[PDB]
Design a protein around this nucleic acid. Sequence first.
DNA 1: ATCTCACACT
DNA 2: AGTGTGAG
Length: 423
Amino acid sequence: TGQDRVVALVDMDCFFVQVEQRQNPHLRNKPCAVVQYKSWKGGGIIAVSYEARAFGVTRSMWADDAKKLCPDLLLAQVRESRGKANLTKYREASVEVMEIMSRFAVIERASIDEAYVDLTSAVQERLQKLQGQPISADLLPSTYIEGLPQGTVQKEGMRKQGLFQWLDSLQIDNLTSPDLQLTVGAVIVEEMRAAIERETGFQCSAGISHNKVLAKLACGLNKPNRQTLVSHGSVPQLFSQMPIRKIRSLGGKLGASVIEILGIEYMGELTQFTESQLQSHFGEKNGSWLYAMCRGIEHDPVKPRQLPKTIGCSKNFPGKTALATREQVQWWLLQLAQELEERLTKDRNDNDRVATQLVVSIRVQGDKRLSSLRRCCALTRYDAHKMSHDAFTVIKNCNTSGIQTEWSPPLTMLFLCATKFSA
DNA sequence: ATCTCACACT
DNA sequence: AGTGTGAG
Ligand SMILES: Cc1cn([C@H]2C[C@H](O)[C@@H](COP(=O)(O)NP(=O)(O)OP(=O)(O)O)O2)c(=O)[nH]c1=O
Ligand SMILES: [Mn+2]
Ligand SMILES: [Mn+2]
C-alpha cells in the first residue's frame, strides 16, 4: 500500500533571497525580493522573502507594483551578463547544498533549490544501530506530523502535542513498521537540515513520506524552517480537502481535465473510481497513476542524478524588442553561445563530461506556442563563434523576408541547448 | 512585453 | 528527432 520506500524532498526557503541575504547583511530579516531587467517597470520579481510575502508580494510581479504593495521592499538584482540574467551565484549555492545533501544518501536534483532523497538504506542502518531505543521528541525539534493532534493555542504548542501523540501511538518493536521508518527518516532529515544550515547559512523545509509526490506536498505544509511528515495513514485526511492541482504533475491541463471530466475537486475523490474506469478517460498510464496516487501510492523512483542532463541558454525578445535584422540575430546567437561556452567549459572541468549535440530553438512573432521551431546539429569544440555560426546555419532558412539583410517575421525568442553528453 | 530544466509521446 | 506538457 505504497509503503515500500521512505522518500524526502528538501526544498530551500526563498532560495535566491537567502543567497542575497547571505551576501548582503542589510537584506536579512527584512521584506526583500530579487529582480530582473530593472529598466522595464523596475524588473520582474523572481524570489520573495517571507516577510515580503506577508504584504502580498509575489513572483512574476513587476517590482514597481510590489513597491506599491510593500513600500519598504528591498531589492537585490540578478547579475546580468551579455544582456541577460546570469544565475551563477544561485547555481553555485545550489551545488553547495547538493554536496552537503550528498553525504547522507543518493539524491535527485529536482530544481535549482530542491532534491529528493531515498532514505530506505539509511533507515535500515539507523534501526539496527538504534536497537529498540525510543525516539525522543528532542531529535525532531522542527518536525510536524500531518493530521495530529486530534481528539493549546500556540503554533509550537500544537506541533509538540502532535509529535507526542505520534511517538506515543507507535512502537519500535516491529522494525518493518512504515511509520517507524518514516520517523527515523524525519530524524535523519533533521540532521541533514541542521548540517545544511550550519555549513551554508541557508534554512530549508522538507517533506518525509513514502514517495516523491507526498514528500513534495508535505514540504509545503509547514514552510518555512520546518519539516512535515506525511504518514500513509495521514493520506485520507490530508487528501479529503486537498485540491487536485496541488499534486505534482496535476497543476496543468491534465488536472483541469480530471476536474472537468470527473466532476471532482479534491484528490481523495479519485479513490471512488476503479482503475479500468480511470484508464477509460485518461489512458492506461494516467489512469493507473491516478488510481495509485489517490491512495497515497506512487513508485516514481528517486533518480540517482545530481547533475543536469542538458545545459541551455534562452532569451525572449517581447513586443517591440523582437529581433528583426540578420545582424541582430547573429549578435544575440553569439551572446547566447558565449554564455553556453562558459557554462559548458566549467561543466566539463568540474564533472568530466562533454556535450555532443547542439539544439537550436526559436520563436517567431505571432506564434502562440512557447517554441515555434527546434532543430539540432553536431556540437564540437565548445566554441561560441562556431556554435553561433552553426545555429545561424540551421535556422537561416526560416527567414521569410525576401531581403537578405532583414529578418521577418521578427524573432521573439532564441534558445541554444547542449545535450547528449559523453564521458 | 516575467529562464531553465525534465520527460512523454509521435 | 521534433512537439507538447509540467514544474520550479
Ligand atoms: C516558479 C519559478 C521559480 N524560480 C526560482 C525562484 C526560486 O528562488 C527558485 C526555487 O523555486 P521554489 O522553491 O518553488 N520557490 P522559492 O525557492 O523561491 O521559495 P519556497 O521554496 O517556496 O520557500 O526557483 C524562477 O526563477 N522562475 C520561476 O518561474
Ligand atoms: Mn524553494
Ligand atoms: Mn523549489
